[PDB]
Amino acid sequence: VDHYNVAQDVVQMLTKYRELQDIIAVLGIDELSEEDKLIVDRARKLVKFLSQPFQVAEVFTGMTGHYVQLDDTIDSFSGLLMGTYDQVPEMAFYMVGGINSVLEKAKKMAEEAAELEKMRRAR
């Protein structure tokens, strides 16, 4: 039942984001209300999380493949739908496996950003 409900919620959110894309392209993201903004952000994160590198795609991509489990996927998607990962950077879900890898990539991105900002301030 958890799998079914998560799938249905994901489909509804993606459909709503697809519908709202047209308004975004006509009136701008600012015109949308806060609820629509949250839905848009969550939908983009879901879209980027659905991406998954393959162990046979090393030559095409240049990165190690990932194997994900059904329970891990369901739990991660449920958390994302509930909003447990709103503060996470959007790009962290791109070309990754589970939520653990997502958090590791977010940590790496934060560390690199802090180092780059420190260098810029030093300049």
Partner: peptide, 30 residues
């Protein structure tokens, strides 16, 4: 008052989330 009187993968994920949030806050502070 009576209720007060009476009385690891998730933990790892929570720790990682806390660490990432702390890193974001630290870079904001910087």
């Amino acid at each position: 008052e009576a209720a007060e009187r009476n009385p690891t993968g998730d933990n790892a994920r929570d720790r990682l989330l806390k660490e990432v949030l702390a890193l974001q806050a630290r870079i904001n502070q910087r």
